[PDB]
Design a protein around this ligand. Sequence first.
Ligand SMILES: CN1CCC(n2nc(-c3ccc4cc[nH]c4c3)c3c(N)ncnc32)CC1
Lengths: 214, 203
Amino acid sequence: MERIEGASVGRCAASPYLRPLTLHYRQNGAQKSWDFMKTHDSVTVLLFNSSRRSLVLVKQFRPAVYAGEVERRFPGSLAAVDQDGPRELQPALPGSAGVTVELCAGLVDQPGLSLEEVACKEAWEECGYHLAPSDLRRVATYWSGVGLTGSRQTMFYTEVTDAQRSGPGGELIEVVHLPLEGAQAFADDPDIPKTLGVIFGVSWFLSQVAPNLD
Amino acid sequence: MERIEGASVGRCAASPYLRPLTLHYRQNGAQKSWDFMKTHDSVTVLLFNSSRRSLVLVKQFRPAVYAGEVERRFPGSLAAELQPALPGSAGVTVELCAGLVDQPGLSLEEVACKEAWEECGYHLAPSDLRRVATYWSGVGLTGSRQTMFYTEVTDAQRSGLIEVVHLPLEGAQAFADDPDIPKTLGVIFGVSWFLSQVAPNLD
Ligand SMILES: CN1CCC(n2nc(-c3ccc4cc[nH]c4c3)c3c(N)ncnc32)CC1
């Protein structure tokens, strides 16, 4: 997975996910405008494999994050693309720089689907776990962009057994069974690039669900 | 504050907060590309006014959120000017005290005590602040880091259009949970974390 070659940044003109806009409005009398983007809602899922006493997460490379780490470590690298085409990434960091630990997640695009379905979908696709929309329990709903994106995200949790997990042996995204003993320590450790989701999830599970179990 | 007129959605060409890009790369052999934006890092602060036994938050209108709520409630509205008519109260969010990490150099703490002064009217010293967590916010389209800090306050540091919200602790939990209030995961985590971590070891 963690093998990325020939990173090059190019200027984006059209994109389905992008679609930036400007909102003009008179606040408290004063006429203003704001720059933001039509971006997609999303759903996240926490799995607890009761049979293994582990939590289920997705470690994967994120390009956004990778390019983010390159900008910190070599500023200006993300100078505006003004060329015949893409700029090559001059100091190119290891693939392991864009690699994040996250909750199982996905966009809310498919027209109609109850969030739960979009959840059980990602839970199948990403983790290889069969889920039923009745199994899922709403944890929280909140906004992610606020600044540049008015996107909602909804979070769900459900318990699983090895009976719902089945995968063959013939790998874009890693699956991460986090054993519960180490869960807390793991969340805290700043060496691991994670989302607040991840941190909240573990934090929440341990406080809310963990005590009322075997 | 919550008074917004003449909402219209408009095509953006240039922006100080935009600069989207496409990253071309060969992963595991396979050539791919991703759409994302050069965006700034950020810092957030949780204040606990010990004197009032309240937590300190910022309620403000966010245009992004407002337009987001209009799209949920009337899809396609964001087809490629348009007048929603939805109330100003639809873009109004409760958030942690927050700011960009733009000013070149500043130790995060300073950017924190800055926003804490500017937004909440609370005097803060970088020594007061306690790192809570660091994590990524965009992941999808951004890949920006955010750092979160917490510190306790007394009415003695508070003396200084965004609202300030003293959330009393009794109601804090219920408040976080309630989906009627547009909030960030920050907000949710903050309350969640404070109650579990700090609240028990106090009077
Ligand atoms: C099976 N295919 C699905 C679409 C692919 N994809 N997915 C995203 C993406 C993923 C998550 C989020 C969250 C907010 N915006 C997002 C965008 C994305 C992007 N920004 N550009 C190009 N291709 C992208 C990945 C592989």
